[PDB]
Design a protein around this ligand. Sequence first.
Ligand code: BOG
Ligand code: NA
Ligand code: NA
Lengths: 418, 406
Amino acid sequence: GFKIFGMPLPLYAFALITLLLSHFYNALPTDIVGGFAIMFIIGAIFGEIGKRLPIFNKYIGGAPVMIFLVAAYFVYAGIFTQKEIDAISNVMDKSNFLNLFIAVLITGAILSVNRRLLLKSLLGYIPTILMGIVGASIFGIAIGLVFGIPVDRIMMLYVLPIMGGGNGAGAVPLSEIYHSVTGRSREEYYSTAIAILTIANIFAIVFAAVLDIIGKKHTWLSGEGELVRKEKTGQITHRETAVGLVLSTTCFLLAYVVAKKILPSIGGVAIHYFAWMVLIVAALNASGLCSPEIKAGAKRLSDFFSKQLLWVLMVGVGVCYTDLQEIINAITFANVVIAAIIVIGAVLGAAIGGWLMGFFPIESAITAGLCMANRGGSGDLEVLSACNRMNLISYAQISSRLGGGIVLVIASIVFGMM
Amino acid sequence: KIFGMPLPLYAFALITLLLSHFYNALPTDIVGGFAIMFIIGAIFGEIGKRLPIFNKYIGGAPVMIFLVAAYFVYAGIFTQKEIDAISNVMDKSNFLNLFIAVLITGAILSVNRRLLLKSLLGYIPTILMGIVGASIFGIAIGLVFGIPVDRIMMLYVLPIMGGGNGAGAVPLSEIYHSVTGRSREEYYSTAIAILTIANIFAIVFAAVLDIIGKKHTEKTGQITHRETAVGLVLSTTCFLLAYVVAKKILPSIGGVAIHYFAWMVLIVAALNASGLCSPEIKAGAKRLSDFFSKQLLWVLMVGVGVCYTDLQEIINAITFANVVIAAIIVIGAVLGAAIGGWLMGFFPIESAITAGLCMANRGGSGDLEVLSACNRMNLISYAQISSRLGGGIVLVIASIVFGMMI
Ligand SMILES: CCCCCCCCO[C@@H]1O[C@H](CO)[C@@H](O)[C@H](O)[C@H]1O
Ligand code: NA
Ligand code: NA
């Protein structure tokens, strides 16, 4: 009766048996039901394992990472069946659980805070991001020349893609800007960019847990899950929580309709729909259209995802947004080192910047540093789960989305300069 | 407030819906889907909830959304994209099964180990007796109207005895499509219509049996999200096992093919009796089922009205023939459960209400409608055994019936 996943070993065995029956008989619906079934079980076991591996389990960050890495190794080693990969992929992409997840988090995180606090951060945050970029560039250029690599490459094939807001946000559009300005094939760029950015993404998740340990070892640096130094609710029901779900989706829809047809770009920046959402939700908070009861509902919902479904999510993240074969194709000692150091440049860059802006250095280096250099949205979840600061999702998204859009403007200029 | 959202807030959402609508910008995925489904379901849910005649016997809040939604597809009110988004949630993502899976699990695990085991020996047989009587009378009156027996079982008997909209119409269409291959909407539209007619007769005879009756005289506390989350694990994992069983291990017990949902009922029921789940977890599954049945039910109907309903066919099968056939099947259940219960040691009137009318009624909403018509509201617990477990039994029987026919 020693529990796995709040399920006693006997009960878990029943499920683990079922998983294996589906696995060996090759019978599985490639849908939500089939997906969650597998994801829950697989996540559960490796979650616990990673939670209790001695060296491997350090801080809180051991459990989310295990599932993620393990799951990727299952795809790479072909342990998953094609139908299983399809089922998981169907939940993450075709059904689009990923966005929902982030949407729920953002909504719940923003609707919990006071209206007075809101605008106070945003003004000091963006500069911190730029500080992180400077540091990411300064260190990149520095290490580039150590390896005898021209600076242009460092900015175009190393720095910019890493800091860029992920696969869809950076690799996809940075190859577009590359082709528009150079004329050389997108694949030539993308293939190198996507590969290297994923390497850095793995370092980002590692250093996230390292900064966690350094934060709890040197309390002066850490805010213990809070970036800024600095109505009570009645009883809650399912309906309030359910309303949280309505608001989570409907806010994403509005943001989507805005970024597609109404206000696709404010200026030189194209605003990614998630960025709009943050502004919409924040606006919705200040408008106070949501009563405290409902505002809690959104929080409560966010908890259910971030604490129950987080393990599930990682199984999906390790499958879809981590091609271990493309990494291998660019694991020359050189890239591994260059990439890692650029991340460290972002860490120190955002640490110093935030410290100057009034935020806690550890949190600043995570939100404005590692969350830039990670693989955008999928990455943010991977990083924030490694340092147990999942409540900063909203900030992480500002860097990955708005900060990613900034990378594009900078990129265009860099490309033009050559 | 609309759907627990104050009118100002709901407006914000309703505005957004219309922006997505007019601008034709909508992700054809879960997020986009639920966004629309929540909002649309919310308004028409309230509308159908406020309507006087319609709420009490027409099914009300759910029926509004499911009919309205169908009219939106038929009248082309929805955009291709919007239909795609909703369909993407219901089929490609397969929310429908998850929904049913969660319900089944929560409904079966909520029955106490003793209640379940004890109920099987006496109450459960009475239910089966009611079904026999419901079938025998149905078949009998079918031929009187020159109706083939297969129709009597598939389009009349089974759907009536099946517990409700979510529990019978929704999954019986699923089993119908999985075994015949014909559209769900063809079945659903006829089934949902007939079953509601019978539901109205059930509430009438409940008051008639009341007059005839008077004329002829371990419960745990600390449930957390994890427990509820475990409910979700068990809901899916139990469906997976059932799926693996139907597809390779035991696709058919004999010449008859057991549909995976039927297996699930047996698996979950087994899991209950095995007591592998502690009361805390067993509640978690219940709580989950509540969240779906009470929050996401409105959403579900928006989806059901889009994919699972054709208006012409459904409008057409409103024939006086149905009125009579349906009523008599109910009477067959009454006499079936009356005789059975009398043989089992229960009072015939009470047996015919709980194991008879509560089967033929519209699942849970129905039980409340029936038990309030005969003042026997204290038998809610029994009524729900019929609507939930007995409904799950109807599914196993239904698979066998379908297989035998084809
Ligand atoms: C104008 C800027 C609007 C977006 C602000 C996003 C930050 C709100 O985010 C919230 O802030 C809290 C206070 O730091 C944290 O405790 C919460 O975990 C975090 O989610
Ligand atoms: Na990045
Ligand atoms: Na019924």
